[PDB]
Amino acid sequence: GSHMWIGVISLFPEMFKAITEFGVTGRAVKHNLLKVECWNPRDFTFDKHKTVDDRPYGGGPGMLMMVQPLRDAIHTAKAAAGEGAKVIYLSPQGRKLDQGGVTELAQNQKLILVCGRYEGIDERLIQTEIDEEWSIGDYVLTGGELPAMTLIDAVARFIPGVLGSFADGLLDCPHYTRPEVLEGLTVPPVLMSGHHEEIRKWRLKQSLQRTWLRRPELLEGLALTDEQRKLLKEAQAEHN
Amino acid sequence: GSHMWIGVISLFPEMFKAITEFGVTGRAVKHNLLKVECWNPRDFTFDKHKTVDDRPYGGGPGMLMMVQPLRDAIHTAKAAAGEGAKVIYLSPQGRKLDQGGVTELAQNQKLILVCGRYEGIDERLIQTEIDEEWSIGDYVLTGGELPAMTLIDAVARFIPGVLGSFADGLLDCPHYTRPEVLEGLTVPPVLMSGHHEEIRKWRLKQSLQRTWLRRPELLEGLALTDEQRKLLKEAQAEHN
Ligand SMILES: NC(=O)c1ccc(NCc2ccccc2O)nc1
Ligand SMILES: NC(=O)c1ccc(NCc2ccccc2O)nc1
């Protein structure tokens, strides 16, 4: 229906088996809700040793991805995607991914994800080939593959049919399952009460309290409902 | 030497092949700089159908991980790790991972990473079994495996021997490799000059400018050197 095609450019395409063969994303792939298609720059080399890296001008300790195989791999993915595919580069210099950003990217029916290795890719390729640069967080990894897979997994959840408290901007409430007592610790009685409205308000209150204690800046981004304002006040009063 | 042991609790241990079999982390594993060891809660079930999920008290659409197999898997990993292993739970409610946080976690010789699935794990297990809760970013994924792999990859880079501009808190400068001209776009002459000190100052200036334009809040966290203050001022003047 609202299926998604994701093209991937990567020197290690077999890494993507982690999402295409397992769990909820693996089911999405098998049910044709999600298609992940990989192109390896190594297949676009012409020298005997299939060289995919190159030295940076100006010197420095690191290598970059070699332009010609990377560029040809990208052009080949773009031709397969046809019109309307947004090309994304994963890097620490990119726009910081968050849930609102995930819902934005989920609007695209087609994506091409370029996974950098070594010190990354030539700046002029970013200018000529990349539409948007994104980061999954403020840390450095050995490659863009885990960030690409993270992005795929996150947007996959918004494909209808893929799934069987972040939505209103709060951290999740605590959850409990069997047994009723675990190392002396009991389940909050309200969760046993069967009183659906009390349970809803307890969970909402807990989410508000948790967000306030752990991530108070997230509250500032919100326009709380009357009910949310009440429950948050009660929680802060009980904490005091 | 300063090798690292990482125990992993996961319903999909084969996902970790993505880091243990490929690239720089795969080399780290083969060279015994990094050891990743997985325990699957499914192996700790006793019923015919090997059930690893359970219903949450209070109702709700989701499932949680079943306590008994998860708990037994964790205890088994802890016994293998011996003393000094810090147990980490990956979740959106956790401390936000950044590079300074990565360098903190990299101090541990032993880690145990618990990967949640479904709606996560019982709150009382977090209290009784988990030392620290971490998030790789403000978004929701289908499982804690990609966050665990992200964390492993990031800390792996600080293991001596694993590697062959974030360090001073700035975004990276632009990088260029062959060819000298790419779709009309030329390499900045300074990078061709062989003038090492000019090249260093150009790169530093670019990093400062890039950080200022894309991530100005990161600059506020820094105490800039005289040189950095000068180059940033020049860059802002040239932008104006
Ligand atoms: N925070 C991130 O989203 C992220 C993305 C990619 C990455 N490493 C590959 C790479 C390294 C350096 C430059 C460009 C690159 O593509 N590490 C972290
Ligand atoms: N931002 C993160 O680090 C992150 C970690 C785990 C995750 N999903 C598994 C899971 C989902 C919900 C609750 C607990 C859980 O363990 N999604 C994102």
Curated annotation (Swiss-Prot), chains A, B:
The keyword ATP-binding does not apply. The keyword S-adenosyl-L-methionine applies. It is found in: Cytoplasm. GO terms for cellular component: cytosol. Pfam families: tRNA_m1G_MT. S-adenosyl-L-methionine binds at Y89, G116, I136, G137, D138, Y139, V140, L141. It comes from the Bacteria. Disulfide bonds: none annotated. It catalyses: guanosine(37) in tRNA + S-adenosyl-L-methionine = N(1)-methylguanosine(37) in tRNA + S-adenosyl-L-homocysteine + H(+). One of its GO terms (molecular function) is tRNA (guanine(37)-N1)-methyltransferase activity. Its EC number is 2.1.1.228. Keywords: Cytoplasm, Methyltransferase, S-adenosyl-L-methionine, Transferase, tRNA processing. GO terms for biological process: tRNA N1-guanine methylation. Homodimer. Specifically methylates guanosine-37 in various tRNAs. PANTHER family: TRNA (GUANINE-N(1)-)-METHYLTRANSFERASE. This is tRNA (guanine-N(1)-)-methyltransferase. It comes from Haemophilus influenzae (strain ATCC 51907 / DSM 11121 / KW20 / Rd).
